[PDB]
Amino acid sequence: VNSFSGYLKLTDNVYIKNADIVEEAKKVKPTVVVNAANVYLKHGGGVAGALNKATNNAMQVESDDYIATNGPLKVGGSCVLSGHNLAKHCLHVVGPNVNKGEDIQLLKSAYENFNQHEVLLAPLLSAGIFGADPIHSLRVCVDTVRTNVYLAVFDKNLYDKLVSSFL
């Protein structure tokens, strides 16, 4: 039993809800919140910009030190950093950004990072400003993640299409 509330159950382990991941994380304070990161951990917009704003830019400060030490992530890769005031940990995961021409096949590799954590609050990878079809992203999530994932979809219209079109 966990403290996630109001989710629709899609499969044994995947759940989905219309919610602002920022507000969800503050309420639940999950062990792991997933960020829709880029390889440079520059959290300028989208989910990443919103999560960083909620940390008063502490996420960005920590991220800049991470990059200065380790260099950029790989597309499809991840790193674990602090969750600041939002969660215990933040798993920064880089899905392909279609608006950069990045290979959509890497979306499965991106979701594989979730399997290293028993329970996660997450957005749909490569959705929003990363340019991929959120319906496809949900399919890859369900077919790749085996741990317990709570998917937060900010847009109410998009959420209804995801559910009503889910197979």
DSSP string, 62-115: HHHHHHHHH-PPPTT-EEEEE-TTT-SEEEEE----GGGT--TTHHHHHHHGGG
Q: Which of 14, 87, 110, 127 binds ligand A1A9Z (CB under 6 A)?
A: 127
Cα separation, 89 vs 166, in Å, equals 30
Show contacts with ligand A1A9Z in window 3-62 (CB under 6 A). Answer: 20-22, 36, 46-47, 50
Cα separation, 64 vs 156, in Å, equals 33
Instruction: Name the residue nearer to ligand A1A9Z (CB basis): 73 or 93.
Output: 93
Q: Which of 64, 133, 155, 160 binds ligand A1A9Z (CB under 6 A)?
A: 155
The count of residues in the chain is: 167
Q: Which of 111, 150, 154, 159 binds ligand A1A9Z (CB under 6 A)?
A: 154
For residue 66, the Cα-to-chain-centroid distance in whole angstroms is 19
| Binding of residue 128 to Cl ion (CB under 5 A) | yes
Sites of contact with ligand A1A9Z (CB under 6 A): 20-22, 36, 46-47, 50, 123-124, 127-128, 134, 152-155, 158
